[PDB]
Every structure is written in C-alpha cells, then in structure tokens.
mmCIF file of C-alpha atoms and ligand atoms in Angstrom:
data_model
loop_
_atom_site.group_PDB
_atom_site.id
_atom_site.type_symbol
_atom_site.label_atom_id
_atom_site.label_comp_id
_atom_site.label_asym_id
_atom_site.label_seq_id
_atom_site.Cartn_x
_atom_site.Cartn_y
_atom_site.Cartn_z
ATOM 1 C CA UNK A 1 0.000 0.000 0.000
ATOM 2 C CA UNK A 2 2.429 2.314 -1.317
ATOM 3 C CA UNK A 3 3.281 5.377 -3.357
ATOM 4 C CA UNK A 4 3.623 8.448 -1.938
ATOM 5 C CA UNK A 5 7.568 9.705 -1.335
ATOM 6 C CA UNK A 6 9.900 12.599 -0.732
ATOM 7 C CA UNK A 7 13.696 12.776 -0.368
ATOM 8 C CA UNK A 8 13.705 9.109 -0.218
ATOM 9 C CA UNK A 9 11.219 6.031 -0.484
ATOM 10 C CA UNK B 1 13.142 29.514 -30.634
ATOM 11 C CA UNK B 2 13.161 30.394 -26.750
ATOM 12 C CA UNK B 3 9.277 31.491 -25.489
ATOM 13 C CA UNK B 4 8.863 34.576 -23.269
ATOM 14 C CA UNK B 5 6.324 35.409 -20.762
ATOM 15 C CA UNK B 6 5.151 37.791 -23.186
ATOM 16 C CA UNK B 7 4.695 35.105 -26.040
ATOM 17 C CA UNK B 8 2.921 32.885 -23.429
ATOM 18 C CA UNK B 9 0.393 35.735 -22.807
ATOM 19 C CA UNK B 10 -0.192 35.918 -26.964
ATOM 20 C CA UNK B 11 -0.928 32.760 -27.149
ATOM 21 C CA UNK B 12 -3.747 32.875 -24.221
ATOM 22 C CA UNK B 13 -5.053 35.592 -25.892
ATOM 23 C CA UNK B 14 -5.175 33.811 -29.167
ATOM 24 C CA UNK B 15 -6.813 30.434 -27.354
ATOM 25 C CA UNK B 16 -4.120 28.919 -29.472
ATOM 26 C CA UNK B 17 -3.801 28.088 -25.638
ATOM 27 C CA UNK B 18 -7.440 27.313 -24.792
ATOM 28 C CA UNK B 19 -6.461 23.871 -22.538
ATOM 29 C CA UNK B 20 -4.619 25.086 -19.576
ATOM 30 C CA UNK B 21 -3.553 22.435 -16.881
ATOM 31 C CA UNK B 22 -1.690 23.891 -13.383
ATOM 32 C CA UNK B 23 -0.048 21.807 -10.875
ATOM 33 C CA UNK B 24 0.664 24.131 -7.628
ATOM 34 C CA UNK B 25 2.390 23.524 -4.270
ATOM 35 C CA UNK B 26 3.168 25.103 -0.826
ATOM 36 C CA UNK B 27 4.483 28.544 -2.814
ATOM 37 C CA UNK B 28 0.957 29.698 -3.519
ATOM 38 C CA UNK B 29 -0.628 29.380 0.033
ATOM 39 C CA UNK B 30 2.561 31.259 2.106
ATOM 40 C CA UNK B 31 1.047 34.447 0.918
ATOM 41 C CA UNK B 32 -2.283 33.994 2.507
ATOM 42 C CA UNK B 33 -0.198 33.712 5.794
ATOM 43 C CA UNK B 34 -0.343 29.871 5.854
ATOM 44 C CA UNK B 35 2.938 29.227 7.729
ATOM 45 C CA UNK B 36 5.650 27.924 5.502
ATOM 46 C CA UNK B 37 5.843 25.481 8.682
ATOM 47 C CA UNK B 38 8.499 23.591 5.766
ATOM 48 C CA UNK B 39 11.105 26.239 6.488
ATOM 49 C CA UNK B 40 13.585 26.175 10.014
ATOM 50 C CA UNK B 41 12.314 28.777 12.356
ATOM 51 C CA UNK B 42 9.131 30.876 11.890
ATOM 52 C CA UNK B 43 8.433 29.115 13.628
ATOM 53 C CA UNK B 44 5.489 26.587 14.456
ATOM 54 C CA UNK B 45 8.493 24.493 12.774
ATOM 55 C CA UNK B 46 10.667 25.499 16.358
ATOM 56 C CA UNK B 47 7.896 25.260 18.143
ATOM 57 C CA UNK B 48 6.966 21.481 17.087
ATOM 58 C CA UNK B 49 10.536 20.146 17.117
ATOM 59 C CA UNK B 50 9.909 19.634 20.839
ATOM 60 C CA UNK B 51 7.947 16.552 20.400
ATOM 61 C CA UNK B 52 10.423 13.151 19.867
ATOM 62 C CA UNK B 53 10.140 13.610 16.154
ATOM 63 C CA UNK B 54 12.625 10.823 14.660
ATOM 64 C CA UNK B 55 12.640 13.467 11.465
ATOM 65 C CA UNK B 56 10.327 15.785 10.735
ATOM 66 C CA UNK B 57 8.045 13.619 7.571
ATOM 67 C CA UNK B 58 6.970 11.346 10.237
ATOM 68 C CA UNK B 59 4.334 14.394 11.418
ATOM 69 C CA UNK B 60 3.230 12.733 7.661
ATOM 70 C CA UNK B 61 3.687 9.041 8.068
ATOM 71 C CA UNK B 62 1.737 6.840 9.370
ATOM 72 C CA UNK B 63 3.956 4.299 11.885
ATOM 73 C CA UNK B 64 4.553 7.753 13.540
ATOM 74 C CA UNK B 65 1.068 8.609 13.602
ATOM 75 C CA UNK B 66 -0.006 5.413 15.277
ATOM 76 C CA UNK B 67 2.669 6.110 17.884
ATOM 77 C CA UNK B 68 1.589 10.002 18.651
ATOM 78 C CA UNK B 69 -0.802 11.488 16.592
ATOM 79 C CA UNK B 70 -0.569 14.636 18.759
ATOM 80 C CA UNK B 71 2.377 16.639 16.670
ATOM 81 C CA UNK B 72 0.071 16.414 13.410
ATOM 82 C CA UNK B 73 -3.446 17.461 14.860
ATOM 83 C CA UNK B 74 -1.172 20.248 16.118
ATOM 84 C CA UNK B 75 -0.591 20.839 13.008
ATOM 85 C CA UNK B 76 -3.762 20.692 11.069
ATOM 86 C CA UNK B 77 -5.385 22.859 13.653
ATOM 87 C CA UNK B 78 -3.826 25.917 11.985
ATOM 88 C CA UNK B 79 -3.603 24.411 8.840
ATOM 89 C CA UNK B 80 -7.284 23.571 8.727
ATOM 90 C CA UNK B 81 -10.165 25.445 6.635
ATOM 91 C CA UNK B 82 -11.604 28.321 7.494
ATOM 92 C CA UNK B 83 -8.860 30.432 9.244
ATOM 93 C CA UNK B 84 -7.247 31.849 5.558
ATOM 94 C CA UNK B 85 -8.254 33.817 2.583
ATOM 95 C CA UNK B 86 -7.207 32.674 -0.970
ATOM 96 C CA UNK B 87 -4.662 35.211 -2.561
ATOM 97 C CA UNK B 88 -3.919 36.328 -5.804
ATOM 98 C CA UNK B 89 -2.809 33.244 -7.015
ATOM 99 C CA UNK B 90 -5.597 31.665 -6.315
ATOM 100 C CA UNK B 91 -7.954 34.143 -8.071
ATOM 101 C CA UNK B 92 -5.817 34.003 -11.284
ATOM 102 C CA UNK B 93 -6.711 30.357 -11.624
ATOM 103 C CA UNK B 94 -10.225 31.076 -10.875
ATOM 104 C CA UNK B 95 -10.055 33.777 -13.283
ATOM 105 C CA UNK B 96 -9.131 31.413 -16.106
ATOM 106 C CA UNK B 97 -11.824 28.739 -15.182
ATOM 107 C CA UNK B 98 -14.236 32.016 -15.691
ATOM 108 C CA UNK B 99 -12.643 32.254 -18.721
ATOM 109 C CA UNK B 100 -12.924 28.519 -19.874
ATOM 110 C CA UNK B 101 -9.321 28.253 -20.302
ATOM 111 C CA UNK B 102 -8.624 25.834 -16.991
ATOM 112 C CA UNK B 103 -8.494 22.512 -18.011
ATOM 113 C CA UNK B 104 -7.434 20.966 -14.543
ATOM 114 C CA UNK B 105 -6.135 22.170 -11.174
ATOM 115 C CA UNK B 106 -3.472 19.485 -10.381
ATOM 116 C CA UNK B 107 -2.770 20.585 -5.921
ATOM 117 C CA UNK B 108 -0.151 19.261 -3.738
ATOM 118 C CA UNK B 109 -1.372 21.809 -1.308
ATOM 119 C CA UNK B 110 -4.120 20.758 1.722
ATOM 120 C CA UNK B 111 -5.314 24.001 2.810
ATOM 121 C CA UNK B 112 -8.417 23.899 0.169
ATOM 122 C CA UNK B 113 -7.795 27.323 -0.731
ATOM 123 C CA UNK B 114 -8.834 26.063 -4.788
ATOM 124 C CA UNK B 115 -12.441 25.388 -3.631
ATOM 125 C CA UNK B 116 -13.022 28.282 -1.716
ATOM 126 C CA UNK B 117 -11.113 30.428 -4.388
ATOM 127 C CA UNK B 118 -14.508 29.316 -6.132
ATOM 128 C CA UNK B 119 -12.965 26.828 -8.259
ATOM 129 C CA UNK B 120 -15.683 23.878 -8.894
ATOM 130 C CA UNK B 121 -14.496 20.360 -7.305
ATOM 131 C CA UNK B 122 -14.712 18.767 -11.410
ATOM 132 C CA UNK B 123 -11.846 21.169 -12.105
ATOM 133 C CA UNK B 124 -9.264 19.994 -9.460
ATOM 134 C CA UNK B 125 -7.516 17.062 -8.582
ATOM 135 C CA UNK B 126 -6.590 17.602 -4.642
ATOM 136 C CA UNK B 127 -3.361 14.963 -5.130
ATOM 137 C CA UNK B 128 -2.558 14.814 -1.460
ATOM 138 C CA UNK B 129 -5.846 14.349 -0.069
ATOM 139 C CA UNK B 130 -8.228 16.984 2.019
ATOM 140 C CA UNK B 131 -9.631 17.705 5.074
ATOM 141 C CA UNK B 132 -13.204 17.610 3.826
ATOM 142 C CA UNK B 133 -13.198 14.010 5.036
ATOM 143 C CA UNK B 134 -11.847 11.469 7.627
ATOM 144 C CA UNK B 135 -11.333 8.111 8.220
ATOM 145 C CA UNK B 136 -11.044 6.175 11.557
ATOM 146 C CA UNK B 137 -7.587 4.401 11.491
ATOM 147 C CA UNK B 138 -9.267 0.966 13.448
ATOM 148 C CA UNK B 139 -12.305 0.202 12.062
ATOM 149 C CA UNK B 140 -12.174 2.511 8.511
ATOM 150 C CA UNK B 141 -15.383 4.511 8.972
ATOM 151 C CA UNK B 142 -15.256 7.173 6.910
ATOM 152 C CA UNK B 143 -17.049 10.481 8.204
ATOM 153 C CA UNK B 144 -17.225 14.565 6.452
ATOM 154 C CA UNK B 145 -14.382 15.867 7.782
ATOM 155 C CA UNK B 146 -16.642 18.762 9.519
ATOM 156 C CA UNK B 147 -17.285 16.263 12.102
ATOM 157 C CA UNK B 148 -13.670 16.087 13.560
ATOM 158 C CA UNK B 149 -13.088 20.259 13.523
ATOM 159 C CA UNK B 150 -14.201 21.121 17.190
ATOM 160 C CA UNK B 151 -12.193 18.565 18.593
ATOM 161 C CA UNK B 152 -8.983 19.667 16.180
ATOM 162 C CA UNK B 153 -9.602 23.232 17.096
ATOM 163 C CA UNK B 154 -9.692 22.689 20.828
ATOM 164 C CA UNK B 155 -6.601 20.491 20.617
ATOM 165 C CA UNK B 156 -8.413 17.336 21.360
ATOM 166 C CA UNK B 157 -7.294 13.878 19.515
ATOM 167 C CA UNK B 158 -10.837 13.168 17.298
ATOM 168 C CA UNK B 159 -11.609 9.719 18.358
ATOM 169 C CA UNK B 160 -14.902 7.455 16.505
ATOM 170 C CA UNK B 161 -17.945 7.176 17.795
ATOM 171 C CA UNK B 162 -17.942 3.425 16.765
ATOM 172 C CA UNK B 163 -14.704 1.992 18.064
ATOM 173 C CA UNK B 164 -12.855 4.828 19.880
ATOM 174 C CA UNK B 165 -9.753 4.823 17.412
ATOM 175 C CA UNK B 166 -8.164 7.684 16.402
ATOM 176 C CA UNK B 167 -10.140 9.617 13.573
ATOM 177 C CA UNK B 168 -7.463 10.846 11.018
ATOM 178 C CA UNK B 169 -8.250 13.138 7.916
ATOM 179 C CA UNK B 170 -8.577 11.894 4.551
ATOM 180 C CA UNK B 171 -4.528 13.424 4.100
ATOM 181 C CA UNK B 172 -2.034 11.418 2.012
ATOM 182 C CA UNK B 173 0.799 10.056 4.123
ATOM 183 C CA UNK B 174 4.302 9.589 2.716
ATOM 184 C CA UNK B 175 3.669 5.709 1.754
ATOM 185 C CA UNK B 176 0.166 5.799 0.961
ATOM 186 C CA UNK B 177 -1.663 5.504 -2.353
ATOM 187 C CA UNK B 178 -3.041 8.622 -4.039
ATOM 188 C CA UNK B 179 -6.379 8.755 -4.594
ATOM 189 C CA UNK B 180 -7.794 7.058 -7.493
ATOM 190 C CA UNK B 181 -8.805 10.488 -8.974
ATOM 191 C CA UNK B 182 -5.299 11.220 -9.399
ATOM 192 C CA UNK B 183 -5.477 8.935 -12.763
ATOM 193 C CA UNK B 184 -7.356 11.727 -14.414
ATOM 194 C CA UNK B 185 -3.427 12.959 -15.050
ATOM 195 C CA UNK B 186 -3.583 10.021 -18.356
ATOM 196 C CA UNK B 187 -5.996 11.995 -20.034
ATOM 197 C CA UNK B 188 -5.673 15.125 -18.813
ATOM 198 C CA UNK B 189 -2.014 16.330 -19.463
ATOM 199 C CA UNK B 190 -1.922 14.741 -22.850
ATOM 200 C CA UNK B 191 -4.909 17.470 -23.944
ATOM 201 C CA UNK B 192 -3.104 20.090 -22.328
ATOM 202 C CA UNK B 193 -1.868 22.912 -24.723
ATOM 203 C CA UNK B 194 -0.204 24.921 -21.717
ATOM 204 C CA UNK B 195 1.093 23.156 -18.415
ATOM 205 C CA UNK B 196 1.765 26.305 -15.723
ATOM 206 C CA UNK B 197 3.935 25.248 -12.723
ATOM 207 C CA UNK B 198 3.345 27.747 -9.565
ATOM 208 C CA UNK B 199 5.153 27.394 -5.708
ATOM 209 C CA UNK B 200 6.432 24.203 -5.955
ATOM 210 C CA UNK B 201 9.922 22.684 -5.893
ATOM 211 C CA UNK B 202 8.917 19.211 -7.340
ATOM 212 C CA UNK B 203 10.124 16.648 -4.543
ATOM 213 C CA UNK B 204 7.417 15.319 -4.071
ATOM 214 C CA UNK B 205 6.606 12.050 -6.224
ATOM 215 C CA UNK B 206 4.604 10.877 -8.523
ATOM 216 C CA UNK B 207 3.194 14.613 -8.236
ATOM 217 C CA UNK B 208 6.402 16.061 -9.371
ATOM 218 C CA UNK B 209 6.600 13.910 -12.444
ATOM 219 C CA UNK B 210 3.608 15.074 -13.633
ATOM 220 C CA UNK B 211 5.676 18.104 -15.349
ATOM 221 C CA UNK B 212 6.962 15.234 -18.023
ATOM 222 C CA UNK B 213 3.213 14.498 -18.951
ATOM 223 C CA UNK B 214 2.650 16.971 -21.467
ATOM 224 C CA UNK B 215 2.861 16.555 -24.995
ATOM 225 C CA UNK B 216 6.671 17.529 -26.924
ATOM 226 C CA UNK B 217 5.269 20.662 -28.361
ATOM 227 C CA UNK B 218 3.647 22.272 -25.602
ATOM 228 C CA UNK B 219 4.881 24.995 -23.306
ATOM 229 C CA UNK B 220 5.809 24.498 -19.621
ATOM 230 C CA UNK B 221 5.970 27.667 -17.885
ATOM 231 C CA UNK B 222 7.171 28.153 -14.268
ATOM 232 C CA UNK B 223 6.590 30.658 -11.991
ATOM 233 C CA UNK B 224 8.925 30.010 -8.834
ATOM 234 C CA UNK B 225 11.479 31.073 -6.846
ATOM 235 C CA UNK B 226 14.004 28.351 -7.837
ATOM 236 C CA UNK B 227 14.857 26.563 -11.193
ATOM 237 C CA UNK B 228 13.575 23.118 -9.978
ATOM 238 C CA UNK B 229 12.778 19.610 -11.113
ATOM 239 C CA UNK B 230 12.217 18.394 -14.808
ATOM 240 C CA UNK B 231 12.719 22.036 -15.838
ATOM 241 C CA UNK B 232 16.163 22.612 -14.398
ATOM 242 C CA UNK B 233 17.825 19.013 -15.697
ATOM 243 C CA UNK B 234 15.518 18.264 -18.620
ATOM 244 C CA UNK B 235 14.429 21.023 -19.982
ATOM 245 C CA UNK B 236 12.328 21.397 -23.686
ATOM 246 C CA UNK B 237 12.530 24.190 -26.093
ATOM 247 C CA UNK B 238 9.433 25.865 -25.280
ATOM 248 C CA UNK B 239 9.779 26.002 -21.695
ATOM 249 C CA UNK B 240 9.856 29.433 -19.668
ATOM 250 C CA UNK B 241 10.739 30.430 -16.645
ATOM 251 C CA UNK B 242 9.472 33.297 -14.128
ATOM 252 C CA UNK B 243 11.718 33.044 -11.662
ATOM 253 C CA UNK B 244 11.158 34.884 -8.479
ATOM 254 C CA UNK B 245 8.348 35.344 -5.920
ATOM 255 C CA UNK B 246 5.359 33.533 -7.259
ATOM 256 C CA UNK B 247 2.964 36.844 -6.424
ATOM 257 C CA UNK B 248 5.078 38.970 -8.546
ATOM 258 C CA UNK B 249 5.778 36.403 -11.997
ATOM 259 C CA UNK B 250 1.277 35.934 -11.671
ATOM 260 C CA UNK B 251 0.848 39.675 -12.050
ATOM 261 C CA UNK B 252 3.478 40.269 -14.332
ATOM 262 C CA UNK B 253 1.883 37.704 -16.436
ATOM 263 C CA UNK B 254 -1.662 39.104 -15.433
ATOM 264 C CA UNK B 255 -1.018 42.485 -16.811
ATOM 265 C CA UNK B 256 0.724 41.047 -20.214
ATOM 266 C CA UNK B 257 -2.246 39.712 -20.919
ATOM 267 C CA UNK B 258 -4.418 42.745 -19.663
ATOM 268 C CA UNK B 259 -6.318 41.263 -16.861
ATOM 269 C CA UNK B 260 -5.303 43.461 -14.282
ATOM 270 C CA UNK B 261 -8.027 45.503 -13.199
ATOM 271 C CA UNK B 262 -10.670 42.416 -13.795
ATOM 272 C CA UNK B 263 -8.454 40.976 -11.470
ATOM 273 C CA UNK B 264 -8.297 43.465 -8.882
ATOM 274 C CA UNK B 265 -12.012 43.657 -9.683
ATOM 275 C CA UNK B 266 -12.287 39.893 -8.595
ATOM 276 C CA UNK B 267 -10.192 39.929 -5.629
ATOM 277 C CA UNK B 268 -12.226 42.686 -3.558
ATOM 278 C CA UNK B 269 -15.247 41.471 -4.508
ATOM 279 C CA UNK B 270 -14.471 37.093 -3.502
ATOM 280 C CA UNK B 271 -12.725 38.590 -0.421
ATOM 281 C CA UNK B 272 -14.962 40.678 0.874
ATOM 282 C CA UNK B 273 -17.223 37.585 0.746
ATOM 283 C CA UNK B 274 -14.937 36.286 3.419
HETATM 284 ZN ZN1 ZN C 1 -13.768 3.507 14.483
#
C-alpha cells in the first residue's frame, strides 16, 4: 500500500 | 526559438492556448499567511521540534502517527479550513476557469484554498488528499471531515464514535496511495496545450513527475522562486521560466495579458465575501 515519497522512499 | 512570458500571454489571448492544466504547491498558500511550517524557524516548525520527532516527515507518516498522533493534529489545527483567505494566485486560476481556459487544477497543497477560491471540485484534482473528510484508522469509517473540527480546534485527539480509534483526515501520508482520482493525469495532461507550474519545488513524487506528462510541443511555464525539477535538468525548447516570488511572476503575467483591473475587480469582490 504504497506510493507516496519525498527525499527518499 | 526560446518562449517569453510575453509570447505565453499571446498565445492565451489567441486560445491557441485554450487547454490550460496547473499543478501548484506550498508557494501559492505562504502568501495567505499559511505558515511555511516547511522552512527552520518561523516558527510553528521550532515550536513542534519539541515533540520526539525521529525526522520531521513522520508528522506525515503513518507508523509515527499510530505512535503520537498529537504533533500532526497540532498541526492541522492551523492548517485547517476556514482560518485563511485565498490570494492572488488563487484568483488568477479562478479567473481562467471564468474564462474557460482551466483545463485541470493538479494541488499538492491541503489548505483547500482552490475550492473556496470558487474553483468547482470537477476542475481539481486535490493529489494529497483533504480535510473535507476522515477516516477512523481501526475500524475505517469514513465520516465529512466537519465532524472532527471542534475537537482539532480545541486540541483534542478526534476519536470514533464506533470503536474509539483515532479519527485521522482523509490526508495522504508519505507511503500511501493517491487517490484514485489522481489517474485523471492520463488523459488530462496529454490534452493540455499549456502546463503552468506555480510554488512548488517538485520533490514530491509521482506529483512532481507530472511536469513530463505533457505533450513535446507544448509549453511548460514556471513561476517560482528556484529553477527546480524536470525544468532545471531536462528542460524542452518551449519552456519558460518566471523566476522569483510567485505573487510577482502571476501579475506580471496578469497584466501582459491585460487582466489586471478584472483581477483586482475579482479579488475585492471574492474577499470581501470572506
Ligand atoms: Zn472507528
């Protein structure tokens, strides 16, 4: 449940 | 050859640019007096380093919300709708949608200062979620978000009325999926004949890569303080740049294209709405 990021993911 | 502001304002004029799609972020909401609570100091930012913070995204990440969901009500209380007035910004993108020019309003921003601007919710695509509605994190009720403000304004933790778990608004957390409405991007920047990028510096993903969307012949101008993303290390040959404070490059385009008194015109009257 994944897919947002920033400055690393 | 290499556009200008001014040739971007012809070709509004001329609805040769009659599809306009704008992705925004955090640069277009400071000047409503939304704390830039991104920047060190000034200050909420000081002020909320006193909780045990590992780093400061986890106020946007789940684990850490489960943990202490304190530091990020904190936060939404003076984020939250109601205290702010949209700015000029704002009102320029309104001002195209009166014009039937505005495609799409592509936000990174959670303030909802695009609706109350009087933007219509068809037109926008709120990419990181909204406070219009909430979820309980234990047994997924979902509930409008106006139920949850008295308890975030009086610095209470919202808790359900089913289970007693923590009630937290529909916001996108680093690690979570977008909303589903976010796939209107496939068709949407494909018929755009202008992409305008305001206040953003394009670190957040997939948002940021959004600015690649657009067809090869279509201009991507930027209005920001920095040279940022896709437009600093790939740029195209009809891309412009506006660089500086985002107020200034929106009325310097507003009066190339001769708007500025129905502007002003629109601003007192929205405003004085309240
Ligand atoms: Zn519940």
């Amino acid at each position: 449940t994944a897919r947002k990021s920033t400055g690393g993911w | 050859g290499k556009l200008s502001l001014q040739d971007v304002a012809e070709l509004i004029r001329a609805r040769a640019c009659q599809r306009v799609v704008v992705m925004v972020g955090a640069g277009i909401s400071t000047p409503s007096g939304i704390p830039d609570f991104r920047s060190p100091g000034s200050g909420l930012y000081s002020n909320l380093q006193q909780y045990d913070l590992p780093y400061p995204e986890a106020i946007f990440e789940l684990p850490f919300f489960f943990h202490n969901p304190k530091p990020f009500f904190t936060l939404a209380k003076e984020l939250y709708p109601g205290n702010y007035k949209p700015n000029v910004t704002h009102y320029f993108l309104r001002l195209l949608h009166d014009k039937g020019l505005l495609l799409r309003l592509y936000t990174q921003n959670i303030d909802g200062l695009e609706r109350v601007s009087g933007i219509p919710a068809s037109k926008l695509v709120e990419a990181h979620g909204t406070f219009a509605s909430a979820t309980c994190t234990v047994c997924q009720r979902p509930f409008p978000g106006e139920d949850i403000r008295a308890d975030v304004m009086a610095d209470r933790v919202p808790r359900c009325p089913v289970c007693t778990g923590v009630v937290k608004p529909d916001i996108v957390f680093f690690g979570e999926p977008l909303p589903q409405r976010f796939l209107l991007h496939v068709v949407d920047f494909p018929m755009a004949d202008l992409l305008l990028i305001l206040g953003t510096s394009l670190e957040v993903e997939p948002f940021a890569s959004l600015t690649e969307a657009v067809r090869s012949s279509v201009p991507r101008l930027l209005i920001n303080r920095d040279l940022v993303g896709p437009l600093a290390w790939h740029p195209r040959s009809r891309d412009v740049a506006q660089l500086g404070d985002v107020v200034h490059g929106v009325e310097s385009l507003v009066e190339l294209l001769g708007w500025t008194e129905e502007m002003r015109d629109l601003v007192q009257r929205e405003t004085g709405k309240l």
